[PDB]
Amino acid sequence: EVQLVESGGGLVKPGRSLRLSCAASGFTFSDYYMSWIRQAPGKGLEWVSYISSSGSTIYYADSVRGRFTISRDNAKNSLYLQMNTLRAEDTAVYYCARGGWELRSLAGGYYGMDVWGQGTTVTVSSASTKGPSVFPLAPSSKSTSGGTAALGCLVKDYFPEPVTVSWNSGALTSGVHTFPAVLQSSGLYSLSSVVTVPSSSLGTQTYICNVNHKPSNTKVDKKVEPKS
Amino acid sequence: QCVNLTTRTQLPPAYTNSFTRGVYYPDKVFRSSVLHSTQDLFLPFFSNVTWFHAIHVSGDNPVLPFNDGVYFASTEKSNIIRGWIFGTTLDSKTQSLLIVNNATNVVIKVCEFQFCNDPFLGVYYHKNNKSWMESEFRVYSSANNCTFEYVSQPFLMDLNFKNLREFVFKNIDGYFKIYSKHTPINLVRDLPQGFSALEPLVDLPIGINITRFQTLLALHGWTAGAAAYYVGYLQPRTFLLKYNENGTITDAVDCALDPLSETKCTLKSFTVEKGIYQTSNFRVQPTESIVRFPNITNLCPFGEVFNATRFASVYAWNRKRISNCVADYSVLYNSASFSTFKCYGVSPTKLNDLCFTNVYADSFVIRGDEVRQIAPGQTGKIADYNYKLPDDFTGCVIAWNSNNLDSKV
Amino acid sequence: YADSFVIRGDEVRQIAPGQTGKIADYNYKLPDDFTGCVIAWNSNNLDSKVGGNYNYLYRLFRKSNLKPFERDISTEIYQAGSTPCNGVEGFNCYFPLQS
Amino acid sequence: YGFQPTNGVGYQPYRVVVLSFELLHAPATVCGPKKSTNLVKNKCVNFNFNGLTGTGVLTESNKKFLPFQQFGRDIADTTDAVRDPQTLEILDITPCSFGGVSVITPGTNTSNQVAVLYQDVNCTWRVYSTGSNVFQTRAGCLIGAEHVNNSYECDIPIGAGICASYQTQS
Amino acid sequence: DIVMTQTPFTLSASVGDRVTITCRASQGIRNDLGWYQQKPGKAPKCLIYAASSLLSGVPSRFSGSGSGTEFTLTISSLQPEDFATYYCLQHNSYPWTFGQGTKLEIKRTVAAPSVFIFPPSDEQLKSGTASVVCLLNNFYPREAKVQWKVDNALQSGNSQESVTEQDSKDSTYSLSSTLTLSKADYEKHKVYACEVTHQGLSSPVTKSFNRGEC
Ligand SMILES: *[C@@H]1O[C@H](CO)[C@@H](O[C@@H]2O[C@H](CO)[C@@H](O[C@@H]3O[C@H](CO)[C@@H](O)[C@H](O)[C@H]3NC(C)=O)[C@H](O)[C@H]2NC(C)=O)[C@H](O)[C@H]1NC(C)=O
Ligand SMILES: *[C@@H]1O[C@H](CO)[C@@H](O[C@@H]2O[C@H](CO)[C@@H](O)[C@H](O)[C@H]2NC(C)=O)[C@H](O)[C@H]1NC(C)=O
Ligand SMILES: *[C@@H]1O[C@H](CO)[C@@H](O[C@@H]2O[C@H](CO)[C@@H](O)[C@H](O)[C@H]2NC(C)=O)[C@H](O)[C@H]1NC(C)=O
Ligand SMILES: *[C@@H]1O[C@H](CO)[C@@H](O[C@@H]2O[C@H](CO)[C@@H](O)[C@H](O)[C@H]2NC(C)=O)[C@H](O)[C@H]1NC(C)=O
Ligand SMILES: *[C@@H]1O[C@H](CO)[C@@H](O[C@@H]2O[C@H](CO)[C@@H](O)[C@H](O)[C@H]2NC(C)=O)[C@H](O)[C@H]1NC(C)=O
Ligand SMILES: *[C@@H]1O[C@H](CO)[C@@H](O[C@@H]2O[C@H](CO)[C@@H](O)[C@H](O)[C@H]2NC(C)=O)[C@H](O)[C@H]1NC(C)=O
Ligand SMILES: *[C@@H]1O[C@H](CO)[C@@H](O[C@@H]2O[C@H](CO)[C@@H](O)[C@H](O)[C@H]2NC(C)=O)[C@H](O)[C@H]1NC(C)=O
Ligand SMILES: CCCCC/C=C\C/C=C\CCCCCCCC(=O)O
Ligand SMILES: CCCCC/C=C\C/C=C\CCCCCCCC(=O)O
Ligand SMILES: *[C@@H]1O[C@H](CO)[C@@H](O)[C@H](O)[C@H]1NC(C)=O
Ligand SMILES: *[C@@H]1O[C@H](CO)[C@@H](O)[C@H](O)[C@H]1NC(C)=O
Ligand SMILES: *[C@@H]1O[C@H](CO)[C@@H](O)[C@H](O)[C@H]1NC(C)=O
Ligand SMILES: *[C@@H]1O[C@H](CO)[C@@H](O)[C@H](O)[C@H]1NC(C)=O
């Protein structure tokens, strides 16, 4: 059908530049305004940029003006952002969107932002790529209550956002809950995944958290046992 | 994208006389020095066309019916008249037709549009910088599932004098027919008293159902100008048309209208000599339509005749009596598929209007090759020894494959 | 002009002037003053899969028969009973197209 | 017949139903899905009685049908009586057009004034127009010509002793 | 520009009942308004494009009402595919500005949390830092408060929380608060306490341990 794809994102240390590209398929590209729209993590939608056909009318946001530059190519059916002197508040998922419909011609579709891209992640952190440090949070009577007791694994201090912790190579799906990673002031992420298990079964069976870090190649299994 | 700028100031509907207007070539044949006749859909003479005036903004276009086809006339001096939109609900869930005249081109679309309540073109710059003259189509708000597309050289928009443009639209058997003519009129306030042919423009392959339509105006804060247009409706009429010593139609007369024109027509001449002439008897037209069927409530046993569990042998075929039920056979559309269905003495398209006497249903099972033998005047063992149809047969024969119920391994 | 489509094998008899049935009533109607030819051939080798081919649809319900060479691509809920359906496809309100 | 599921199509079983009926002569009880209306009498209507269509005026009748009869026919074999299938009352069907018409012209090379003679009307109406100068004659109602008391030689013969002429113009 | 305000902003409902969302505007927009729906992790999609008109493929339980201002979206007879975050966007003048969203949550009988406090592992105190985790397990009202106390001093500005998505089975939430200290500062106090306040608790629950007591 009609489609919009993007490319160009990743990780950039602040004070440097990036270039996002977006390619369309199935439109008449000269009959529509195009737009770039960001979404910060844990927040709402917010427009970044609008451009008309032939690039005469250009709208930036007040937070981004003087640093970002839109461009079109109606022959190549392409949209750009040149993002200069990046900052730590530009860590977001970006979307190519069409909503134009250009009131001088006979276009098709709906009037509105009907078609969308898939999103491209931009991460700004003077970090680099660090591996996680793992500790086991033991089941304890302060965590125990009646029939069940909780134990888990704390995986902290890593930059490369996608990280996973499983329980017993993917065996336990009951009570296993990984909490959203937290971003510290140090610039590195951290999280903790915990699972409850009957208090009759404190040390009895196997509870080994399998930590895998995919941008790096870290794979470590840590056993959690009641406190000494 | 939509802005309805209307003012709630109704308007007394005016009328005016189309004396002899709206005569087209109802064929592509050439003819000279003759007086040809033709029953068609025409605009009758001395009729009551409705006058819509665009001056009503001082200190206005409705949706109009499309009964059988219309005659449309525009005066104006510039080009404040753009195209039209045609349909039956002017909405989504149904397709619609759009004819608009942008700049340097004429586009035509059939799609599923979502037109505004007051669709218009908005043009502003014809003066400012005298360049660009950007436009603004405030026609619809969504256009998808389009089928037909046409972009061609524009309509009659060449070139004090007003420009009378005449159009005739009619929608017949899935086509759209548009005839047109352009004339530099001089007399103000009305369509003239001359006689012009309407050479045909287009025959669009559309195939949608049209009941209503509306016209789209170009406004130049939007001001409207002071042009006007005229709408008249077509009726099935018989016309007497003479052409000229070189094609081109000079005159025509419409029988049904008046008692004199009847004689002019039956004489096949435009002049009548002194005397007295016999015309047709006095006719009265029917005012209503009535249907009177008996009080029947049940539905016929479609599911214990076609959906039975065991059929008879052809040598001992079964005969069943049917009475006191409505024969709505559309219920067989989901659960049945017949490979043979043929009626004799009646048309299949008439079965829904009729009422049937002495209805019997004969059922049996035969081989696949012998279904051709169930017909009047056939030979073979089934028609000779098992089941014979009369030559004066009235009714239908229905047959379907049942390999899934009457065969074992 | 050339009109093309795909139907069942039993319904090829319904492509003719003056016929009745769901194809001739709700999907494709030929004029009685028809000039031209009708051509049809079996395509079991291209339009069937081993699990089934549900790409080809047809209209099963309509309020009135079609006019010659008219095409209806609407998908409103057909009200067969005595109650408005509000476009929710409940009981006695059907989706018009089947496969 | 030996019916096995691995037969050729020409040897597979087919179920056959033959429906037989008669049309438009006797009382019927099947009918279709059509819906009925009310009975409008003393007017020109299109009618559909048990599938039999037509046009005309329906009036109450004095004919009395036997129980096995539904339609009545005249000598020209047209249906002129019918039994209403819901009220079981007999109705007469009379045609709608009736009466001759002639047009009197002084020639269209002199004027397009005309007079019209309705040869079956008696006014003291089934006319196209009423205008003025309505004059009754033993040949019909003449509309559009003024009656005078003089007498001349015949110019345009209307009939029954009456003539017409383009004098004083009218 | 033209600002938009959505009034409900974290509405909560059961399944199969009526839901209203109101969106206002700071100028006169005629009918140019769209309603958009975003499920977590995906791209947003249009539902109503001219303040009252559904798109092709949208079920007929969504409803739009509109004017110059004061637009309304209504979902009657809620179904479990309709729990997402809903935005209103204006199409009148460029640049096109969004609303603020409205997350829609699933009802659930008041459930109090299981609370649990975890002291820092001996491995981490070698490294020179102490994380003190406090867990709140299963709970409807997410408006829970986690007060850390160290030797009975309310601790401000050294904790972080995160919360899980509403559970697809029992429609509850779970919350983890982490208190981060240095080894040095950890070793300066005794009682570490975590006091949880919540509607299913008649008075707050404190789980606590004493640094250095097996
Ligand atoms: C009235 O409407 C028409 C259709 O909506 C417009 O016609 C369009 O004109 C364009 C340029 O004149 C055409 O674009 C060209 O298409 C060909 C493909 O055949 C390409 O090779 C060309 O590169 C391309 N040129 C450009 C500059 O894009 C459109 O194809 C044509 N539309 C259609 C459907 O054919 C008219 O422009 C419009 N009138 C005004 C005044 O805008
Ligand atoms: C154009 O005017 C119409 C009617 O005044 C507005 O359309 C709505 O129409 C439906 C029925 O078609 C009514 O039930 C609504 O009450 C109307 N809306 C309002 C707000 O009254 C339409 O909104 C107008 N168009 C624009 C662009 O304002
Ligand atoms: C068709 O008839 C028209 C007029 O009825 C002819 O036009 C005139 O032709 C004569 C000589 O042929 C000229 O002297 C006149 O000046 C013409 N009048 C006009 C108004 O043009 C025409 O020639 C005929 N033949 C055709 C069109 O082939
Ligand atoms: C056909 O149905 C109509 C009603 O639909 C019946 O008409 C009734 O006739 C009786 C006479 O005995 C009247 O008292 C009623 O008022 C009639 N009903 C209506 C609604 O007009 C008619 O009787 C039915 N046909 C037969 C043969 O009974
Ligand atoms: C004949 O038998 C068939 C099959 O048992 C009946 O068809 C079903 O009809 C209903 C209503 O149209 C559908 O919902 C079902 O899907 C049909 N069955 C199948 C298997 O698809 C049919 O109603 C029967 N005929 C009679 C007169 O009762
Ligand atoms: C074309 O569309 C019109 C829409 O009006 C159909 O005409 C009838 O419209 C009324 C609306 O008041 C409906 O209640 C009727 O059901 C419609 N008639 C029928 C027979 O369904 C008209 O039928 C359409 N044309 C065709 C060929 O279906
Ligand atoms: C064009 O019309 C077709 C129907 O003829 C629409 O196709 C339907 O799409 C919806 C949404 O996925 C499905 O639920 C239906 O089953 C589809 N029906 C058929 C027959 O395919 C299509 O969405 C329409 N296109 C647009 C842009 O509105
Ligand atoms: C050498 C062959 C005999 C030549 C006989 C010549 C003329 C006889 C006329 C017709 C013979 C028709 C034979 C087919 C019968 C099929 C019967 C049926 O099932 O319908
Ligand atoms: C079983 C009830 C007896 C029938 C009632 C009496 C007369 C009805 C006359 C014709 C009905 C046609 C039968 C069904 C044909 C469907 C046509 C098709 O699908 O192609
Ligand atoms: C036109 O119609 C009006 C009323 O609809 C009527 O009064 C008038 O006489 C008609 N005009 C002509 C010329 O018949
Ligand atoms: C009638 O008209 C023709 C042509 O206009 C003319 O030749 C004839 O003389 C006219 N009749 C009389 C009586 O003058
Ligand atoms: C017209 O009716 C009158 C009385 O009703 C009658 O005398 C007369 O004969 C009728 N007309 C003619 C000329 O027969
Ligand atoms: C014409 O004749 C009638 C006959 O009664 C008479 O009454 C009248 O005076 C005469 N003159 C007229 C009416 O022109």
The contacts of residue D120 (CB under 8 Å, 6+ apart) are B282, D98, D99, D100, D126, D140
Q: Which residues pair with A152 in a beta bridge?
A: A137, A194
Looking from the CA of residue B335, the nearest atom of ligand 5 is: 7
Question: How many CB atoms within 10 Å of residue E79?
Answer: 11
C-alpha to C-alpha distance for A10 and A161, rounded to whole angstroms: 11
3-state secondary structure of B332: helix
Distances in whole angstroms, Cα of residue C99 to Cα of each of B67, B339, C15:
36, 19, 19
Q: How far apart are CA A173 and CA D67, in angstroms?
A: 84
Shortest CA gap B102–chain A (Å): 8
Contact B143 A106 (CB under 8 A): yes
Q: Are B54 and B227 spatial neighbours (Cβ–Cβ below 8 Å)?
A: yes
Cis amide leading into E95 (omega within 30)? yes
Q: Is B399 in the pocket of ligand 9 (CB under 6 A)?
A: no
Residues paired with D158 in a beta bridge = none
Residues in chain A: 228
Coil, helix or strand for D120? Answer: coil
The residue assigned the tokens 């109090």 is: E112
User: Using CB atoms, which residue from A119, A138, A192 is nearest to E178?
Assistant: A192
Cβ neighbours for A126, distance < 8 A, ≥ 6 positions apart: A13, A14, A187
Beta bridge partners of D101: B279, D118
Residue D43 corresponds to which tokens in the numbers above? Answer: 């007017």
Q: What is the DSSP letter of B264?
A: H
- DSSP-based helix, strand, coil % in chain C, nearest 5: 10, 10, 80
Half-sphere exposure of B282 (CA within 13 A, CB side): 17
Angstrom CA distances, E131 to A191, C88, D22, D164, E189, stand at: 11, 55, 97, 126, 14
Q: Which runs of E-coded beta strand occur in E110-202? A: 114-118, 129-137, 145-150, 153-154, 159-163, 175-182, 191-197
According to the 3-state scheme, what is the secondary structure of E3-54? CEEECCCCEEECCCCCEEEEEEECCCCCCCEEEEEECCCCCCEEEECCCCCE
DSSP B274-314: SEEEEEPPPP----EEEEE-----SBP-TTTTSS-S-PPBG
Which of ligand 7's atoms lies nearest the C-alpha of C73?
5
Determine phi and psi for E143, rounding to 5 degrees: -65, 45
The helix (H) or strand (E) run that includes residue B381 is helix B381-381
Which of B95, B147, B337 is opposite residue C10, by nearest beta carbon? B337
> What distances in angstroms separate CA B131 from CA B125, B126, B127, C24, one per listed residue?
7, 7, 8, 55
Single-letter amino acid code for the residue at B296: I
Q: How many CB pairs under 8 A join B and D?
A: 291
E206 beta partners: E195
Look at the block and give the residue holding tokens 């369509």.
B191
All residues of chain A having their beta carbon less than 8 Å from the beta carbon of residue B146 are 108
Contact B56, B223 (CB under 8 A): no
The Cα diameter of chain A in Å comes to 77
H helices then E strands: how many in chain D?
A: 0, 12
* Count of pairs with CB atoms under 8 A, one residue in A, one in E: 119
How far apart (Å, rounded) are the C-alpha atoms in residues B72 and A226?
Answer: 92
- The residue numbers preceding gaps of C to N over 2.5 A in chain D are 124, 168
Any E CB within 8 A of A225 CB: no
B344's CB contacts (< 8 A; 6+ apart) are B376, B393, B394, B395, B396
Q: Minimal Cα–Cα distance from E116 to chain C, Å?
A: 48
**Which of A193, A212, B149, B321 has the alpha carbon at shortest distance from D19?**
B321
Terminal alpha carbon distance of chain D: 92
Task: Give contacts of B 61-120 with A, CB under 8 A.
Answer: 100, 102, 107, 109, 111
Measured in angstroms, how far is the CA atom of residue D114 from the centroid of ligand 13? 24
| Beta strands at B106-122 and B137-152: parallel, antiparallel or unpaired | antiparallel
Helical segments of chain E, H only:
122-127, 183-186
The helix (H) or strand (E) run that includes residue B267 is helix B260-267
Q: How far is the CA of B300 from the centre of ligand 9 (A)?
A: 10
Cβ <8 Å between A111 and E49: yes
Query: For residue B41, with 0-12 CB atoms within 10 Å meaning exposed, 13-18 middle and 19 or more buried, which class applies?
Result: middle
Best of B335, B400, B402, B405 for a ligand 5 pocket test (most atoms within 8 Å of beta carbon): B335
Q: Which residue has the tokens 């070189």?
A: B246
Q: Name the token pair of B63.
A: 């949706």
Residue nearest to atom 25 of ligand 2 (CA): B4
Residue A70 DSSP label: E
Q: Cα–chain-centroid distance for residue A116?
A: 17
Per DSSP, helices labelled H in E59-181 are 122-127
Q: Inform me whether the C-beta atom of residue E58 falls under 8 Å from chain B C-beta atoms.
A: no
Q: Is the CB of B380 within 6 Å of ligand 8?
A: yes
Say if the Cβ atoms of B208 and C71 lie within 8 Å: yes
- DSSP annotation of B12 reads -
Residue ranges lining ligand 1, Cβ < 6 Å: A 30, 105-106; B 102-105, 107, 151
Helices (H) and strands (E) in chain E, counts: 2, 17
Q: Torsion angle of alpha carbons B262, B266, B270, B276, nearest 10°?
A: -70
Tokens encoding B295: 């009080």
Spatial separation of the C-alpha atoms in residues B275 and D117, rounded to whole Å = 13
The CA dihedral of A7, A11, A12, A18, to the nearest 10 degrees, is 0
Strand partners, E185: none
Annotate B78-91 with b (16+ C-beta within 10 A) or e (fewer): ebbbbbbbbbeebe
- Specify whether the CB–CB gap between B135 and B101 falls below 8 A: no
Name the DSSP letter for residue C66. Answer: P
User: What experimental approach yielded this model?
Assistant: cryo-EM
Question: Bridge-partner residues for D92, per DSSP?
Answer: D59, D81
**Chain E contact for A63 (CB, 8 A cutoff):** no
Q: Is the CB of C64 under 6 A from ligand 6?
A: yes
Strand partners for A189: A158, A183
Length of chain C: 99
* Backbone conformation region of residue E10, classed left if phi is above 0, alpha if psi is from -120 to 50, else beta: left
Atom 15 of ligand 5 has which residue's CA nearest to it?
B335
Residue B335 touches chain C, beta carbons under 8 Å: no
- Tokens matching residue E55: 């798109």
Cα A79 to Cα A48, A65, E178, E179: the distances in Å are 13, 18, 43, 45
How far is it, in rounded angstroms, from Cα D21 to Cα C59? 31
Is the C-alpha dihedral spanning E13, E19, E23, E24 positive or negative?
A: negative
Rounded distance, CA B179 to CA B198, Å? 6
Q: Which of A49, A50, A54, A51 is nearest to A30 (CA)?
A: A54
* CA proximity to C13, closest of C30, C32, C1, C26: C30
Q: Which chains touch B (3 or more CB pairs under 8 A)?
A: A, C, D, E
Ligand nearest to the CA of D150: 13
What CA–CA distance (Å, rounded) separates E74 from E17? 10
Closest Cα to atom 12, ligand 9: which residue?
A: B329
In chain B, DSSP finds a helix count (H) and a strand count (E) of 2, 23
- DSSP, residue by residue, A182-203: EE-TTS-EEEEEEEEEEGGGSS
Q: Please, which chains are in contact with A (at least 3 CB pairs closer than 8 A)?
A: B, E
Q: Tell me if chain A has a CB within 8 Å of the CB of E96.
A: yes
Which two three-digit tokens encode residue A104?
A: 């001088």
Strands B288-292 and D44-49: parallel
d(CA E143, CA C54): 50
Which atom belonging to ligand 12 lies closest to the Cα atom of D138? 13
Residue B332: both structure tokens together? 């067989």
Phi, psi of B372 (to 5 degrees): -65, -20
Contact state of D28 with B401 under an 8 Å Cβ cutoff? no
Would you say the C-alpha torsion E76, E79, E81, E82 has a positive or negative sign? positive
Region for residue E169 given its phi and psi (left: phi exceeds 0; alpha: psi -120 to 50; beta: otherwise): alpha
In this complex, which chains have at least 3 CB pairs below 8 Å with chain D?
B
**How far apart, in whole angstroms, are the C-alpha atoms of residue D13 and residue B91?**
51
CB within 8 Å: B277 and D103: yes
Cβ partners under 8 Å of residue B149, min gap 6? B107, B108, B109
The number of residues making up chain D comes to: 170
Put simply, whether B299 touches E (Cβ < 8 Å) is: no
Q: Do E98 and A46 touch (CB under 8 A)?
A: yes
Q: How far is B26 from chain D (nearest CA, A)?
A: 28
Query: Minimal Cα–Cα distance from E83 to chain C, Å?
Result: 20
